[PDB]
Amino acid sequence: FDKYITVFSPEGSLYQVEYAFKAVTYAGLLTVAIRCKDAVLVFTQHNVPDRLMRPDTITSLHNINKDIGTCITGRAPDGKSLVQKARQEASEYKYRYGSPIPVSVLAKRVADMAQVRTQHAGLRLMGVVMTFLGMEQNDADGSWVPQIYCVDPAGWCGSYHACAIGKKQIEANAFLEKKQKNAPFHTLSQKDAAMIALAALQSALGASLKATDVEVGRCSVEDHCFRRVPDEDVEEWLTALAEA
Amino acid sequence: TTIMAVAFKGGVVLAADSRTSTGTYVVNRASNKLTKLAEKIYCCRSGSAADTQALAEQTANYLESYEIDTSKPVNVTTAANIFKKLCYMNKWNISAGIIVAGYDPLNGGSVYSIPSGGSCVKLDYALGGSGSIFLYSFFDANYKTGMSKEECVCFCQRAVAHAYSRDGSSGGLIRTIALHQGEPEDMTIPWTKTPYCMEKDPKYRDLAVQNPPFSSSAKITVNQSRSE
Secondary structure, eight states: OTTTSSOOOTTSOOHHHHHHHHHHHHTOOEEEEEEOSSEEEEEEEOOOOSTTSOGGGOOSEEEEETTEEEEEEESHHHHHHHHHHHHHHHHHHHHHHSSOOOHHHHHHHHHHHHHHHHHSSSSOOOOEEEEEEEEEEOTTTOOEEEEEEEEOTTSOEEEOSEEEEETTHHHHHHHHHHHHTTSOGGGOOHHHHHHHHHHHHHHHHTSOOOGGGEEEEEEESSOOSOEEOOHHHHHHHHHHHHHO | OOEEEEEETTEEEEEEOOOEESSSSEEESSOOOEEEEETTEEEEEEEOHHHHHHHHHHHHHHHHHHHHHHTSOOOHHHHHHHHHHHHHHTGGGOOEEEEEEEEETTTEEEEEEEOTTTOOEEESEEEESGGGGGTHHHHHHHOOTTOOHHHHHHHHHHHHHHHHHHOTTOOSOEEEEEESSSOOEEEEEOGGGOSOOGGGOGGGSSOOOOOOOOOSSOOOOOOOOSOO
């Protein structure tokens, strides 16, 4: 009964929330995000099993507006419904206050959408983790700083230096923890950050990657916009890793 | 107000004056009536400042959403259609004449006119505002298709100067923007460097003879300048 709707079990837990988190791994893909000195990057597996599928129509990355990107991990159509609600939110904010929504504010608004379904009966929770990426401005000096914020099915909202989500996330997080001990990720260049993210994917999947197996997104101090990184730029990061 | 847009080979030029007034007093002498709707699409606004600011902002909001949903840059015809619908649904409660103009790679440079009443007409040039009435004849005599971008900027600057020298409700700066496949180019001419005004035209230097001195003849000569 506690297994079927949002009420508490006797130990204080919510089972539909636990099960919505297994939906995140059931989908079978892995994502990694990392923030370095001047940028934020996100690397997700591009799976095109069927040889007849048109690869440029399958994506886990989307723009919310010009300057904010998302990566969906988990049940794919659930994630597309949250992309549409986030788009609507960012456009209401701009009408009301006359400026584009900051990435920390947007993440909190989507986290509230999720919490409402853990507390009202009759609508299914969405079985996804949404990762949001963007640059944010300081009020002191006016300089811009990259951010990563993740939102989970319970309505939790949090910021990271780097994060792995999906199948074998436990092993990929362990891996990034080790690498962090050498140098904090905010001192690293793009290339060094990228070599750590690609090495973590490979280590956890237990395989070798070509450029066509990963899709990558980026925002930077140089160009605020969220943009897909070209396959040629990724090849050269993988080449650089294969050497060392 | 004097606004206009003209097509050229591969784009458009928009132009305006900078005055906002309550009839006989100037509240702002440096308004900006060329309003951005998307990277390469602008409108020109005439009538009630409050109404045109509000409908431009709403049209821009809808174009930004559309562009994110399709992942492509929008066409001029889509901006004109959205704007037309807002002007037509609210026609009894607003005072607005709009011109929408811009560049897109499907149709090139395009100009649309949306006058009071909410009609939508696709043209080679459009005029609007109180000052337009002074320019119908200027274009009928001196406008040609196929001008270059620099010809067209110069022509529109001259056209705006002629209208504002005769219309009391127009004046101040001339603002222009040119939209084509490259980057947008804005320009502001100050009144002191205007290409035409009555005050510096030599055929209006000498004063009319209205006040001739008391004389023994009916011949009219000069105005009296000193007491007898």
